[PDB]
Ligand binder design. Sequence first.
Ligand SMILES: O=C1Nc2cc(O)ccc2/C1=C/c1ccc(OC(F)F)c(OC2CCCC2)c1
Ligand SMILES: O=C1Nc2cc(O)ccc2/C1=C/c1ccc(OC(F)F)c(OC2CCCC2)c1
Ligand SMILES: [Mg+2]
Ligand SMILES: [Mg+2]
Ligand SMILES: [Zn+2]
Ligand SMILES: [Zn+2]
Lengths: 322, 322
Amino acid sequence: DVLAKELEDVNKWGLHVFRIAELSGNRPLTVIMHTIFQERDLLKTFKIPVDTLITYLMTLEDHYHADVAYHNNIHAADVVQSTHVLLSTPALEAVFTDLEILAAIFASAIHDVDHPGVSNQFLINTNSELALMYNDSSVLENHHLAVGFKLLQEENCDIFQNLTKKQRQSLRKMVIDIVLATDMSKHMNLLADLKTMVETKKVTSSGVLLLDNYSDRIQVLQNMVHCADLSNPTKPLQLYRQWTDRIMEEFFRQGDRERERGMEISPMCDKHNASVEKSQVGFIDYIVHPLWETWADLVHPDAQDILDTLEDNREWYQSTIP
Amino acid sequence: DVLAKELEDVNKWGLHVFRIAELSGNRPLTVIMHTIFQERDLLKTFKIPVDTLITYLMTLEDHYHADVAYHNNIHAADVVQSTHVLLSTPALEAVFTDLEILAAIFASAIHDVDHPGVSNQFLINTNSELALMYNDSSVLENHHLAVGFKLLQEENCDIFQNLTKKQRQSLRKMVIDIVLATDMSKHMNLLADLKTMVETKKVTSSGVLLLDNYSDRIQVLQNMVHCADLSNPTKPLQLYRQWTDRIMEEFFRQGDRERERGMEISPMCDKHNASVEKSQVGFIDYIVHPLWETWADLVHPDAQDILDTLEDNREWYQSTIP
Ligand SMILES: O=C1Nc2cc(O)ccc2/C1=C/c1ccc(OC(F)F)c(OC2CCCC2)c1
Ligand SMILES: O=C1Nc2cc(O)ccc2/C1=C/c1ccc(OC(F)F)c(OC2CCCC2)c1
Ligand SMILES: [Mg+2]
Ligand SMILES: [Mg+2]
Ligand SMILES: [Zn+2]
Ligand SMILES: [Zn+2]
């Protein structure tokens, strides 16, 4: 009922994703992906039959873990909706084709699927089967991709059945390139390249940015989904604080497994010695703001409302520290 | 007796690995690895129980496919032994630690394990489970590593059981770095970096190659195993020709399945339009000789006889075309 009203803000930074999760019966990924596919007219641009989209989105949502506090289907729905908005920055218009747009969105949707709630380093240090499979390199991100594509092969789940063979092949490559770039261990390289693109930036006199080679473009799409993955501190405070509660619950539960198994407690995962508010402001100062300020430069200045909220939320969290 | 006589050649380029395969009851990898570990005193240095070593080597050898013409246990034994000889070159004396020596030989042993006899691109184009798992990136090479490390966990198979935690961490990363560098799609960049090193190379007062950081050391080990992997045309001709027979069988059988399935036949995989001799000449001219000429420069003059044989074999295959 009122699910319909909440969804009408699908194009706005600060969607009530947690409400939409409650109202949809814990299906925010499905309903937000559905809505967005209509808003951008993708069920026809790519001849996706509507029931095939739902069957896949439902199976995909099921492979996010409901007993994981942060890396679940609400985070996936939130990154989807956030990428959907960053794709409409005025300074990007005419930059991405429809296939590149479908790539960033599908990638956002699968980018954390089957997340166990622990870090790559935890999986490596524990000689997990995942790290054995993927040779310690972007272990989670490779797994997210493998599962996300694998589910397409379930019954009536191939939402790409009517893409041409080359379209499928191009989409698969772009999705892989995007999701692999969500690995935080690649944040610094990715930001350095985004800065280089800012210095050597080229633009119409009318604001809009000009990217010509695939290398530059996929680099923007990687940093874009990376943005949406690190967009919690840029949302309104009541949203951000719930995200902070959830990631800290996940960190603490990993630190508890590191304690029970008797290994070193990873940074910020020690519930007996954690400063949640000092961590958030350090997260902003060293990762989220350098990132979003570089991105705001790239799309100068359609990102101001977002860079503003980020600096507001950083001031508030700092004020919670005596 | 006869086998022990042939294994006395284990320090010599052009060891008759096919004889040793026959004389060992199709166990060239087990007996050559065992001989080399004894030769380099590796069982004592790393407290490897001999029964654990034999058990792992036989399990590892089992997981090479006896029905694959080239990428079988004979190729693995050949690359192990060729790497063993390259490690002994005078320009590298006392350069590498026993752990790095262990990493390079171990990497050589597992570097093609469970190879199905088709290329990465074929596994990508046939939507294989392997390409699905590894997101189209170094599909085979990631799989070889996952299998080689996983078999260490079988009953009495952990040959690294008495290494320190730090030794095992360091070895695992070096082995991963080395095997991933055997992906031929990385050959151009790996050779470009090897050229740069030769142009700027440093030698010690003892005349030996100076490598004072991990990036330089792992790059030499990467190219060394890469050279051993592409060493068939540098071997005595009667060995080279049998390798060419085996790789062409594998190519033709892949091209058969490509034709059977409606796909374009990969280059050199079409038996009805193959040019074996011209392909070997182009293989040497564009891949093998540029690589080995650069390696010979790096270790000059230690590799002059190997380079001479390569140029003789090139001339011979060339002379069979008119
Ligand atoms: O901690 C994280 N590790 C990650 C690794 C990845 O490959 C991708 C994202 C994150 C991530 C995200 C994250 C998302 C939200 C956070 O806080 C808040 F915005 F919800 C947050 O805070 C942690 C970092 C310092 C304090 C706890 C971290
Ligand atoms: O063809 C190949 N593709 C590869 C991909 C890899 O990641 C690693 C090795 C090879 C390889 C090796 C190879 C090894 C020996 C050959 O011939 C001979 F030396 F045995 C040979 O010839 C083929 C390439 C040109 C003609 C056939 C190819
Ligand atoms: Mg992730
Ligand atoms: Mg190989
Ligand atoms: Zn995420
Ligand atoms: Zn090989």
